[PDB]
Tab-separated table of N, CA and C in Angstrom:
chain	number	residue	atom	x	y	z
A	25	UNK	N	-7.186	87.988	69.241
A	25	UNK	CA	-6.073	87.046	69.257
A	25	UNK	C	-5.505	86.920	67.852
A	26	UNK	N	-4.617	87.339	67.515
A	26	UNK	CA	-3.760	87.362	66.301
A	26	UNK	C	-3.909	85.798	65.914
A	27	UNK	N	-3.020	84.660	66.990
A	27	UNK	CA	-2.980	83.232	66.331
A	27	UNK	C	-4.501	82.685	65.900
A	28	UNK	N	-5.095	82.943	66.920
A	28	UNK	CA	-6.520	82.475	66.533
A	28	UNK	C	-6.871	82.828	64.747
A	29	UNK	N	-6.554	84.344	64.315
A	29	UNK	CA	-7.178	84.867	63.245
A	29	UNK	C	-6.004	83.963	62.835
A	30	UNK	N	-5.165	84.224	62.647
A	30	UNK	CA	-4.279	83.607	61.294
A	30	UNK	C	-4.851	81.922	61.168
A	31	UNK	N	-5.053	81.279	62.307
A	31	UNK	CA	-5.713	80.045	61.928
A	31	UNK	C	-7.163	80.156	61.143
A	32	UNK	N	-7.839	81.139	61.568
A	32	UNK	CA	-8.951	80.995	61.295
A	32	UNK	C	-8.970	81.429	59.650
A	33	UNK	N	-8.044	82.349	59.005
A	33	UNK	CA	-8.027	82.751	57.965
A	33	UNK	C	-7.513	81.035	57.113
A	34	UNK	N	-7.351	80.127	57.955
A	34	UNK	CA	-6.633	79.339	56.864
A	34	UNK	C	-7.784	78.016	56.421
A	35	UNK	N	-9.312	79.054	56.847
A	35	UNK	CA	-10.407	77.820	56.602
A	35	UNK	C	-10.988	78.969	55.691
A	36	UNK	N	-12.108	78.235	54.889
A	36	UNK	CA	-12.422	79.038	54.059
A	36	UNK	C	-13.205	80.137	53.830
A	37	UNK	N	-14.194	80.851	52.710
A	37	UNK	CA	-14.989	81.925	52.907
A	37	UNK	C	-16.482	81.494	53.730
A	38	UNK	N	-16.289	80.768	54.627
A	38	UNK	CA	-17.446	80.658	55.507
A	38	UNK	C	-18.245	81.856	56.675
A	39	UNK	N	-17.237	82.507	56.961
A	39	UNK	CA	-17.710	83.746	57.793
A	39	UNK	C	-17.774	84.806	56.705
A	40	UNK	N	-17.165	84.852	55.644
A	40	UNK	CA	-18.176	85.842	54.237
A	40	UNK	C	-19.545	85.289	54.103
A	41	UNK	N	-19.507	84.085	54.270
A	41	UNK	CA	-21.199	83.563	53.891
A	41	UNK	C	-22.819	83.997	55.057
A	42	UNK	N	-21.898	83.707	56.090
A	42	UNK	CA	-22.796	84.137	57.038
A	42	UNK	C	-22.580	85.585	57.518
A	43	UNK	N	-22.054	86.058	57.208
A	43	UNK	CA	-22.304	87.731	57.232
A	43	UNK	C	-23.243	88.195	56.166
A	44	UNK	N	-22.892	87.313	54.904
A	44	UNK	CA	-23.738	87.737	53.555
A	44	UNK	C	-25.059	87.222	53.903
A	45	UNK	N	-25.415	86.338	54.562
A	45	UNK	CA	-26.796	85.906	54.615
A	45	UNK	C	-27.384	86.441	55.856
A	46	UNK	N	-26.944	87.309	56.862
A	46	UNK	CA	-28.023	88.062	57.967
A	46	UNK	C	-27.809	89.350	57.045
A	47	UNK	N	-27.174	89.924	56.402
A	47	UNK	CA	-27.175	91.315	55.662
A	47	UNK	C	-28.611	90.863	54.997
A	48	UNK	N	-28.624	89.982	54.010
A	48	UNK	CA	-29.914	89.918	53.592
A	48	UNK	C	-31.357	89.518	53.603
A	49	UNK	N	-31.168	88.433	55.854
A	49	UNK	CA	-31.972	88.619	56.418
A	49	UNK	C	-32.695	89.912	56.592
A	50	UNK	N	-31.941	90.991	56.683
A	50	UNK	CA	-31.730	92.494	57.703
A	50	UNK	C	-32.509	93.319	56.770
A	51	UNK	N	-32.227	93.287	55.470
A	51	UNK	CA	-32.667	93.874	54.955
A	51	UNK	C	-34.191	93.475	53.976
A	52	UNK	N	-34.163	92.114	54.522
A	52	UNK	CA	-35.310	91.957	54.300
A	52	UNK	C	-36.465	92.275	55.034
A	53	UNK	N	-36.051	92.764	56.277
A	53	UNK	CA	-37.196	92.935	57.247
A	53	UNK	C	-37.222	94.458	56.590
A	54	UNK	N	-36.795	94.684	56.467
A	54	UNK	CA	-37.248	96.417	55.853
A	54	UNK	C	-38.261	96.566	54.611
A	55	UNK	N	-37.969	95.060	53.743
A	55	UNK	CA	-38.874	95.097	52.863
A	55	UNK	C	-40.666	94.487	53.387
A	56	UNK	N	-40.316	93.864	54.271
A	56	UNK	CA	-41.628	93.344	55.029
A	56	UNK	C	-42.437	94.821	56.024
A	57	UNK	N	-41.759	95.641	56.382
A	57	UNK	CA	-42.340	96.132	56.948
A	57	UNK	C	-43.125	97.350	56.022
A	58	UNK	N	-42.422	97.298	54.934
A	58	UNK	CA	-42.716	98.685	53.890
A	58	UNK	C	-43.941	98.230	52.722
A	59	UNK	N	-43.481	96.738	52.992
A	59	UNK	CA	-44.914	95.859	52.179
A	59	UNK	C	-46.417	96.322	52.531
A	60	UNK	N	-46.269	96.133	53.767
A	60	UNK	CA	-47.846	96.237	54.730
A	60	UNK	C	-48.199	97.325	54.779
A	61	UNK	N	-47.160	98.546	55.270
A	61	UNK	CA	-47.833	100.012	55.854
A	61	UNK	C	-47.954	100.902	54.755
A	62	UNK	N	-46.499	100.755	53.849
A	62	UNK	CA	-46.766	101.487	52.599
A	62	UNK	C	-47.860	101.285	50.851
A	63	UNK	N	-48.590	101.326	51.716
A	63	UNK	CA	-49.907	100.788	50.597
A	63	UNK	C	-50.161	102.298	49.889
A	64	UNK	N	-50.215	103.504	50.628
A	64	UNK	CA	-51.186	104.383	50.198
A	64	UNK	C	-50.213	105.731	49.999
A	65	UNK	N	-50.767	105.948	48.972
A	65	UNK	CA	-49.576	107.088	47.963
A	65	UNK	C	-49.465	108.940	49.093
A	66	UNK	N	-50.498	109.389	49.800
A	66	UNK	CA	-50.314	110.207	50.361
A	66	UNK	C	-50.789	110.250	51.281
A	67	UNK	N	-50.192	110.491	52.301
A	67	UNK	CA	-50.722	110.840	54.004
A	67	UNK	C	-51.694	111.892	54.017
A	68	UNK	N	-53.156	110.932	54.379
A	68	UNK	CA	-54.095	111.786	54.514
A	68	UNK	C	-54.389	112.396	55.677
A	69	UNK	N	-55.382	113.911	55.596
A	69	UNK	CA	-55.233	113.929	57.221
A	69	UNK	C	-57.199	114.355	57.352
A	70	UNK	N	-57.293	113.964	58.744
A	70	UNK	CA	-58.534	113.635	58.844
A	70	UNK	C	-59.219	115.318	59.444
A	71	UNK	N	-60.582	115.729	59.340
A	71	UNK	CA	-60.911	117.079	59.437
A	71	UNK	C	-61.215	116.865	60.866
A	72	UNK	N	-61.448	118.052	61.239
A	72	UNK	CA	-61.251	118.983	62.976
A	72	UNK	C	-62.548	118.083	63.583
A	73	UNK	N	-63.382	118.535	62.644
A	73	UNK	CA	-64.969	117.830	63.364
A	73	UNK	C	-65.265	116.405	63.048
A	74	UNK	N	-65.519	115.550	63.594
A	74	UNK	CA	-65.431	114.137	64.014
A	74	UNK	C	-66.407	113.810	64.383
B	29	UNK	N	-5.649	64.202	54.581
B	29	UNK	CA	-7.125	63.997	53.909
B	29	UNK	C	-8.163	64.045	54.405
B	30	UNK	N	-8.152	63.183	55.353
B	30	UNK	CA	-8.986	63.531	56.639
B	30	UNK	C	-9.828	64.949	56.613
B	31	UNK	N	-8.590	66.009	57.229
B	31	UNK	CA	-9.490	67.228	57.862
B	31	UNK	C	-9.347	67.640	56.060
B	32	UNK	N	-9.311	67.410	55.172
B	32	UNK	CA	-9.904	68.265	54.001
B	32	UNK	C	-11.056	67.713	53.384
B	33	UNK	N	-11.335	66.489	53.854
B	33	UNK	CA	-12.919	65.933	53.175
B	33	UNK	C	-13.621	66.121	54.224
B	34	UNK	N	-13.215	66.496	55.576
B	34	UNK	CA	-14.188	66.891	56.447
B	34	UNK	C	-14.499	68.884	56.073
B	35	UNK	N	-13.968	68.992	55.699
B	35	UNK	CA	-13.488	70.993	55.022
B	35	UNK	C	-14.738	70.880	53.970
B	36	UNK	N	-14.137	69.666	53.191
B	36	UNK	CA	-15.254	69.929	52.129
B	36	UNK	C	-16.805	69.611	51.829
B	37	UNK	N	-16.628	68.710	52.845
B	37	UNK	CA	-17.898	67.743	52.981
B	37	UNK	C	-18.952	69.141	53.924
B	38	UNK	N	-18.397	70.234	54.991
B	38	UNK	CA	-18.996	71.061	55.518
B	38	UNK	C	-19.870	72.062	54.710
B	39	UNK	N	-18.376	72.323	53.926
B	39	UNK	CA	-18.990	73.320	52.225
B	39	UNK	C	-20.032	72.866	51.509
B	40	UNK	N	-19.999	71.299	50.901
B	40	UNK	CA	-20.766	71.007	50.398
B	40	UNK	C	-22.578	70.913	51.255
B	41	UNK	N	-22.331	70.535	52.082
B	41	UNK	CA	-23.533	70.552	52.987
B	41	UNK	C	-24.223	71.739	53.503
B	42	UNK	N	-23.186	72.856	53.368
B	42	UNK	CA	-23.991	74.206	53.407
B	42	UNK	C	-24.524	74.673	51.964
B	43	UNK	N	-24.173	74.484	50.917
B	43	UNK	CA	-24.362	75.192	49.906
B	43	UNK	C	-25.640	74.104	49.550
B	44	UNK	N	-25.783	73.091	50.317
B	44	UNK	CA	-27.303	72.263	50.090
B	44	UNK	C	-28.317	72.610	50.746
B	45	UNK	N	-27.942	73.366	51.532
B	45	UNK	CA	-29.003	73.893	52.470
B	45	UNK	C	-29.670	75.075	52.450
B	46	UNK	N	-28.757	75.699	51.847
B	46	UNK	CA	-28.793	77.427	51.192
B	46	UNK	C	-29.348	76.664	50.101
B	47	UNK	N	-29.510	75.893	49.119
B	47	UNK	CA	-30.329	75.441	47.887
B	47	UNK	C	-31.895	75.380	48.153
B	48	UNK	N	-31.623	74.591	49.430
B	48	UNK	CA	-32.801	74.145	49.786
B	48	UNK	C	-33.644	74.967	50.111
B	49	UNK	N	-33.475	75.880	50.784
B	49	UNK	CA	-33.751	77.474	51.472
B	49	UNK	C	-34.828	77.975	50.184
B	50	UNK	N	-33.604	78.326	48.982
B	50	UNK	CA	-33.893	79.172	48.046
B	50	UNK	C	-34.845	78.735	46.841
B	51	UNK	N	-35.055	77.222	47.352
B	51	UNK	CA	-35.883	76.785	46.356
B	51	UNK	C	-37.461	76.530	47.338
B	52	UNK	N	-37.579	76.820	48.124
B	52	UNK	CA	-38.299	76.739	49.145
B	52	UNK	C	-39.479	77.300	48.495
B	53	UNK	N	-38.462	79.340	48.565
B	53	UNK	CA	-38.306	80.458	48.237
B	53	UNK	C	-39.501	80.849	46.666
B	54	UNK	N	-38.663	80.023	45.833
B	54	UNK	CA	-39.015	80.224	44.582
B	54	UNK	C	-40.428	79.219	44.168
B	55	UNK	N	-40.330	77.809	44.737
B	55	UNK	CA	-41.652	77.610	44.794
B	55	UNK	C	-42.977	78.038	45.389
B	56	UNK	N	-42.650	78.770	46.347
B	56	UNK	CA	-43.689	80.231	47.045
B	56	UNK	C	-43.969	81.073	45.906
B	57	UNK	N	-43.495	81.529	45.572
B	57	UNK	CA	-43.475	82.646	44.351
B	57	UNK	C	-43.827	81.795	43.064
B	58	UNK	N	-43.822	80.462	42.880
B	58	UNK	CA	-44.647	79.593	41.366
B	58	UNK	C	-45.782	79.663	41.771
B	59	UNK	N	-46.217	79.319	43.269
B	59	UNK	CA	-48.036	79.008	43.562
B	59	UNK	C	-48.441	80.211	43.583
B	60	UNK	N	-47.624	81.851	43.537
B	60	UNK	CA	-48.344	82.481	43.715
B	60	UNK	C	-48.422	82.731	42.386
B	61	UNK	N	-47.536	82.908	41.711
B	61	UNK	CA	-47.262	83.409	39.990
B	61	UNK	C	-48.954	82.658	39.252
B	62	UNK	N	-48.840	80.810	39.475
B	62	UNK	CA	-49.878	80.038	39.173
B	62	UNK	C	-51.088	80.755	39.906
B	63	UNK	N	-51.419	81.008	40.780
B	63	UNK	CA	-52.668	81.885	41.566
B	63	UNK	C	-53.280	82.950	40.381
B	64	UNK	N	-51.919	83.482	40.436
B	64	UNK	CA	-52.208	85.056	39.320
B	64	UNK	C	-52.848	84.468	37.760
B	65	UNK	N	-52.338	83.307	37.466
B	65	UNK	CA	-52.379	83.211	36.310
B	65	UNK	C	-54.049	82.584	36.039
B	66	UNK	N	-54.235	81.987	37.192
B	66	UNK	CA	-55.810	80.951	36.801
B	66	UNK	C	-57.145	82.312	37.460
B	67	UNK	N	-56.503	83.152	38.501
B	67	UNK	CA	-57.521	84.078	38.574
B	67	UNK	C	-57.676	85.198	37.726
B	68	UNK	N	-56.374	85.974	36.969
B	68	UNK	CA	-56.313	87.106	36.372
B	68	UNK	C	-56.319	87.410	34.802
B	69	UNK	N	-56.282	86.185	34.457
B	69	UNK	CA	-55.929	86.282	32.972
B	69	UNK	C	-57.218	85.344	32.683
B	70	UNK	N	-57.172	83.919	33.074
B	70	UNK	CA	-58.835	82.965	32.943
B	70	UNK	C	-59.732	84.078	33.068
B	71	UNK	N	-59.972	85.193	34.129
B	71	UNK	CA	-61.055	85.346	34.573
B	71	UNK	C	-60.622	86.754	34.906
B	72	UNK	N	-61.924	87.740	35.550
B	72	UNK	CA	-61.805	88.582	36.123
B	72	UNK	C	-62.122	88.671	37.832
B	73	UNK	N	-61.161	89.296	37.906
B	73	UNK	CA	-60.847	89.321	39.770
B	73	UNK	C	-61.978	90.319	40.491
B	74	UNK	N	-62.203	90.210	41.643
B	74	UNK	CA	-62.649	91.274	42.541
B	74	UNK	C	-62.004	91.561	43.770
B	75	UNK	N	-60.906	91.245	43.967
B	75	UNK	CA	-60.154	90.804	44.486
B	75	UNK	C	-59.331	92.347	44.547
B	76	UNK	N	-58.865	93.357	45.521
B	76	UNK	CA	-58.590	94.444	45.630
B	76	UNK	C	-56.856	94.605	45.296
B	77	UNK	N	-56.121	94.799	44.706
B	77	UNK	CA	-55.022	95.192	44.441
B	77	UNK	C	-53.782	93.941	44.283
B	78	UNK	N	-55.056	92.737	43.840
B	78	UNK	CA	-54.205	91.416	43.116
B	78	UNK	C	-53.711	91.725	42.084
C-alpha cells in the first residue's frame, strides 16, 4: 500500500531499530553455536579396530 | 503536541529498555571478568580452559 508507506515513513527510525536488533539476535546464535562445538583445532578420526 | 510527546515519550521508552538489556549484558561479563580475576591471577586454577 503506497498511502500506508508514505504514512508510515512519516514516524521515525523505529523499524531501522528492530530490524537492527533481530540481525544481531541472528547472528548471535551463530556465535553460540560455534562457542560449544568448536572447541577442538582438528577433526580427529577414530581407527578401524574398536 | 499531543501525538508528538506521545512519538517521543515511545522513543524514549525504547532506548530505556535497550539500556536496560545491555547493561544486563555487561554486568554478566563484570561477574565473569571478577571470577577470572579472584581465581586466575590470586591463585592458580585447575580448572580446564578458564
Amino acid at each position: 500500500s503506497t498511502e500506508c508507506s508514505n504514512l508510515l515513513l512519516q514516524y521515525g527510525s523505529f523499524c531501522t531499530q528492530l530490524k537492527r536488533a533481530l540481525t544481531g539476535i541472528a547472528v548471535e546464535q551463530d556465535k553460540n553455536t560455534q562457542e560449544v562445538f568448536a572447541q577442538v583445532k582438528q577433526i580427529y578420526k577414530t581407527p578401524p579396530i574398536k | 503536541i499531543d501525538r508528538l510527546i506521545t512519538g517521543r515519550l515511545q522513543s524514549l521508552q525504547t532506548y530505556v529498555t535497550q539500556q536496560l538489556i545491555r547493561a544486563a549484558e555487561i554486568r554478566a561479563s563484570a561477574n565473569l571478568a571478577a571470577t577470572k580475576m579472584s581465581e586466575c591471577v590470586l591463585g592458580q586454577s585447575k580448572r580446564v580452559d578458564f
